[PDB]
Amino acid sequence: NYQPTPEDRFTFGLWTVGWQGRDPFGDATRRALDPVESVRRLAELGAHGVTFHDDDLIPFGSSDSEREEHVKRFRQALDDTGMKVPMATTNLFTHPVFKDGGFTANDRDVRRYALRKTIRNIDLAVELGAETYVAWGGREGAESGGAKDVRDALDRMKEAFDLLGEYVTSQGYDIRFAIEPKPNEPRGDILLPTVGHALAFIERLERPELYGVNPEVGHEQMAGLNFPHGIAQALWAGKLFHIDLNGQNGIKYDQDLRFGAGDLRAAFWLVDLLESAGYSGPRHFDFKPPRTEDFDGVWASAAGCMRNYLILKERAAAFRADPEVQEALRASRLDELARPTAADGLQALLDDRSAFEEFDVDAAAARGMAFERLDQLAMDHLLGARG
Amino acid sequence: NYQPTPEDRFTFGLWTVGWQGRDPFGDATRRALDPVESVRRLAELGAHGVTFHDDDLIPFGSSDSEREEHVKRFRQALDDTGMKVPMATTNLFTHPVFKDGGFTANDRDVRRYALRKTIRNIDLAVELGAETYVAWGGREGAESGGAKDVRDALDRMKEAFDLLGEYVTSQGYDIRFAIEPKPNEPRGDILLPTVGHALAFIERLERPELYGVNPEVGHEQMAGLNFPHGIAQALWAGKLFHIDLNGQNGIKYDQDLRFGAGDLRAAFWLVDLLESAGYSGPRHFDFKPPRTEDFDGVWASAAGCMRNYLILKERAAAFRADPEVQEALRASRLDELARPTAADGLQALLDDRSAFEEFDVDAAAARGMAFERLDQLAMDHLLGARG
Amino acid sequence: NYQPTPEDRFTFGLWTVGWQGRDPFGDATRRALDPVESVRRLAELGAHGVTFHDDDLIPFGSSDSEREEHVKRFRQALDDTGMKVPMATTNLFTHPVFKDGGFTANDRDVRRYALRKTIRNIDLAVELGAETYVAWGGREGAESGGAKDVRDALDRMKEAFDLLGEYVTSQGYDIRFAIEPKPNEPRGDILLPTVGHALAFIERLERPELYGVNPEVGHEQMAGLNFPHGIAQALWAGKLFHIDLNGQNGIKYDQDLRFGAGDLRAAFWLVDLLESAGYSGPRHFDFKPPRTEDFDGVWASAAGCMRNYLILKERAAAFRADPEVQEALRASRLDELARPTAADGLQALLDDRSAFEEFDVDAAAARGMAFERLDQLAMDHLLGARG
Amino acid sequence: NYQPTPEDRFTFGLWTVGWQGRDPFGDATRRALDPVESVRRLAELGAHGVTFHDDDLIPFGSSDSEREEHVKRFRQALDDTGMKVPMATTNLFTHPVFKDGGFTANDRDVRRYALRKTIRNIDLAVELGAETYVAWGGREGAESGGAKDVRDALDRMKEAFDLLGEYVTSQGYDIRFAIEPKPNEPRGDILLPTVGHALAFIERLERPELYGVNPEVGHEQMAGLNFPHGIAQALWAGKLFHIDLNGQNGIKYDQDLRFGAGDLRAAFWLVDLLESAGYSGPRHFDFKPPRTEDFDGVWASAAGCMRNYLILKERAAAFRADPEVQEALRASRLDELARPTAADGLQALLDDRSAFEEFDVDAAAARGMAFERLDQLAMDHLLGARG
Ligand SMILES: OC[C@H]1O[C@H](O)[C@H](O)[C@@H](O)[C@@H]1O
Ligand SMILES: OC[C@H]1O[C@H](O)[C@H](O)[C@@H](O)[C@@H]1O
Ligand SMILES: OC[C@H]1O[C@H](O)[C@H](O)[C@@H](O)[C@@H]1O
Ligand SMILES: OC[C@H]1O[C@H](O)[C@H](O)[C@@H](O)[C@@H]1O
Ligand SMILES: [Mn+2]
Ligand SMILES: [Mn+2]
Ligand SMILES: [Mn+2]
Ligand SMILES: [Mn+2]
Ligand SMILES: [Mn+2]
Ligand SMILES: [Mn+2]
Ligand SMILES: [Mn+2]
């Protein structure tokens, strides 16, 4: 009955289940959680681990002794439960000093501060065992055209990521970076707005091998993009270092519904791809239990994330294992798509009359793709309606 | 009075002014144009040049002698007018054989055919003087999840572009490639859906220096993205080889309004960026005169493309030259955004107490960005309402 | 195994399965169907009926004898199969004369012509047994602000619908009208763009009781609206005269995927509502088998429409019948939402201190809605994963 | 130089300039304003008036004496400045008790409380001279399908508005209601999501003449709708009681940019319509100075709202007064759109052979609409580029 265990690698941000329900139009509807209680409740549901921003774990402004006690208690809860911390990140968005950005703030002093605040937390992340360090440039961008020269901003972004790569290399840390795209919100337009923009940017860094992406289901959907396509491109590039799983209903504010909510068919095709490709990172949920909910509803929502992943994984596996689907996939020439177009080489292609002068374009045109039949087999699998 | 001349480098696709007004719900409202007449009418309006798909210039299915006559007449009109042909491209979308794609069709034979059809037209393009060869993968993608393994598809896309780079290198041609993104339409989701995805893909090709992007105003807007931001990223990467200028009202079907229509402020910020960055390629319009229009309306629409570019160029130049705007730009710290964050290096940043231990975060936070004032100066410039 | 029969009331437009696959960027990929063959193939799949535009059944420009023969053959196929014709409509979009609209064309002569063309087809529709006559104002609107004074246009729309109501009343026909909204495409913005706009407009007609809506799943989704919410408002108003069922992936061009594709959860909640409310009209599919498909794929796609409706109907029924869901619905106070807020009346509400002066707002606030648990029960039902 | 004065009727919400800059991802960047200071600063900029939610003017939880002092001080500032209060509204969204709605909360007690809280503020609004009372059902809706039966919810909405109409009638108040649509945010989908849905709903209330709409530029744009079209429909219905003016860049979170920002051409066509139709209500701004800004930037942003309205009003007036535009409007048959289609009546239309049997559809089809030329005249006017 789709019961998660820690071997499923399901992780949650402290800020997910810990969200107090403050939105732009309303006050908190739940009390703050102690991170220790979250670790414990998550462990009991079958989670593998948690993730954190610096400021989720240690209140902004903490003294050294406060900080040490917060980490001690957190460490104890990890030890008490067997929970891991596979990823951490910096809060470069909440404090008003970040109003125009961290790494790409117009104020140089803010940019230096952002870097120092990040580096401090990289050390903690390594201490707690994290393998991935996420950057989410939520304040990087603009509401107006004159406010942000984007080429200068990208020069500053590159400089910041380059410094961080220098830093981790200097300490001999194994931790890698993952850039999390989001196209807008809270800035009118955010820099590196999609998986593609982040991938492209990475290839200009000094040490590109240190940086991948942390794509979020809802964020690519906020641009109307196909999330499984973006993930496939990321996998193709060898850069799917981490993922954020959740739900989103179309192009609107960032909803952060529980995974499986939102675009259910996209969630099926995502799980199909992750499993087929052998993604081996954390199955991380970045979701907000709706503010309608009390604490019991919080845990139900979190449980549903993991349940939905496990149901979808079962249905996708059944799909790809069904001989009738295997025959449909052949009928639709998915096998041919996987073959080289011209392993014979350029000159042979140019000399091949069956590729042009004698290619019967009408007979090719007339051959149906059989994609609808294929897709209804997939529907029938997803819904458990195989006849 | 904003009169274009050929030195402004304004170009038009044959298929733009030549669009007969057939849409998915209706028949043509205008007769087909002879390319010769289009060259002549465009020249008379002050255009620099035209662009073409193979099948715009030579009807699909033409005999060798037909083809030779079509090119002869076209060449004569170019010679008669002084018009250039800076760019060409392949029609890999109209014929039913391309229903599942060209380069990423599931049918291998179709993929080979697509390559041969492209290579034939590369030779013609070079003969007519083109410097850029555009690819627009409009049929590459899917309506359903099972129909297209995207990693295999990207393997096939890479293979196709690699073969084309091999081909041009083999002939000693100077022509370069530009990939034109579009996120959807006519496929439910199109591969390389944005400028970012195309940039990232390019970095995996064998000879990345041969490939840039041809971003279109309306296409990035179809994903709700900020077109001037995308162009800036493209410029940052050194990959703005060509551009398509037009208008689009938000996230909907591809409207291809005349340039300046649609998102007028985005058009102002685009022209500001292109001019500030010194983009020196063609100012190419990919637009559709609405099907409401007759031939006189066609030419009025095309004239308006060039007029709007020239008005915006004047207003943007006035903006950046106004000492009052220069002072506002300083007040908003755009000068600081252009300075390195830490030219002193990593260790100096780590040892700089003013970056962290003694950084007054509240005083920084309290400093307004003054972006609204800046933006109203920009509004006042755009509208010619300076007091 | 979810086999449809005619008692399920599933209907298809001739133009759905008959779509030849011409899109704005490509030629037809299938031959034209004879309406007789469509009736027969649909009947064999378990359909109840078909619908038509005038010009689907009788080619535009037909002679009286041609017209009579087309109708004869169609009638014979209906008689041969037991198929019905519950709805008909006018093509006021394809011919170039409708380029600026039918009923709201700027040219008065076009507007009169649109009315005459509609009235002719109303007579045929009644002859073939239709109970609903759909209007889809696809050409009514604008690409630019100056082209269409919308108040004058709505005066013309009202005039046209009023004349049609006069006409049907004059003939003693029982047929009613249903306005089908679409927000854009093929016009940049279409008048009466949503269910709400159409409902509101209807209340200004001379005989509002003669007019309802024909909402389409994909069209409301093209504005990012919640289709089941729109249907509920339509049901609330007593105006759900007919429906178009299909799928759509977000805000983009009108995709017309088979029903169940697109937003699968919205399709579940739609079927839940239609069945719960006792909608008794046709379950009509307005879909396009993708142009990738051959004729076999056409019929598979159409079969899948009906299959998906039947699977969803089963899952929704199981949901609402499950005692555990009934208890969750109580826990979430859906029973209370159905009770009057103040059946005691205004003065009693004003005098009720428990409504204000002594209302414990914090205790109310603290009561979780339990909506996540409810929603995962719904997920588990939809997926057939009840434990 | 486009200097506003109180005769321009420009109004601002206390919550607009008073927004402290808290967003879902960050803390306030400005201190709270005293409403008295806002009245004074707004008056100095040339505003006519302010608007308020109950809880903007009197802190939630105030004692009777606190309340009396808050109103006293506010009244004094109004008297000191000559500012008016043309509109007021209720906060039925901030307090956690409204997490599932006010008027359509599932909890009946919450619904009664919402009504009492509204009625209390109606009395204050009348005391301060307001002519319009706005309802914005921001918490009315759902994130999941099972949580909200929408027909029951609309029964509750109708009941609430009916009670409020009973109340104002009982007191002999002249104040009227205006429903402000928003399609989503903070609920996943909000009930009455557009101008159309609100118009339609109004026609089912007991006393429909008491209720109009308060459409907001950005909210209709959040559904990709054409705001000037929606306003025209509202004007057509006689229901434009009040308006919210601001800017929005497409389909995304509710940005509330200063008026003129966002979609500049839509702002031009809006002002053209409001002025042409003789809208005589407040020109009310519901905007958020971006959180990047300090207090000086707040006032600059607010000034820019009024400036942009005045520039657009000048350009639109020049457009409609230009004899060359008047001739273009005739060329495009806008004069004909304003004439009745068939003032001769139904039988005469049926007997008119020039409407059908002898209508030359090809000659009509061939007549260009000349809309592009018209639209470039409008562009040239907007930009001050008339040659
Ligand atoms: O980077 C970690 C997280 O930071 C913030 O909480 C963002 O809203 C979220 O999307 C991101 O995944
Ligand atoms: O690639 C050349 C052109 O091909 C097609 O006409 C596309 O619709 C267009 O966007 C593109 O710019
Ligand atoms: O009105 C009947 C039909 O006409 C057209 O085919 C439209 O594209 C479709 O949505 C509509 O349902
Ligand atoms: O109803 C008054 C106002 O309430 C809230 O502040 C809303 O966010 C806003 O759009 C609305 O106009
Ligand atoms: Mn998110
Ligand atoms: Mn995230
Ligand atoms: Mn385009
Ligand atoms: Mn293009
Ligand atoms: Mn449709
Ligand atoms: Mn339809
Ligand atoms: Mn708003």
Ligand SMILES: [Mn+2]
């Ligand atoms: Mn508002």
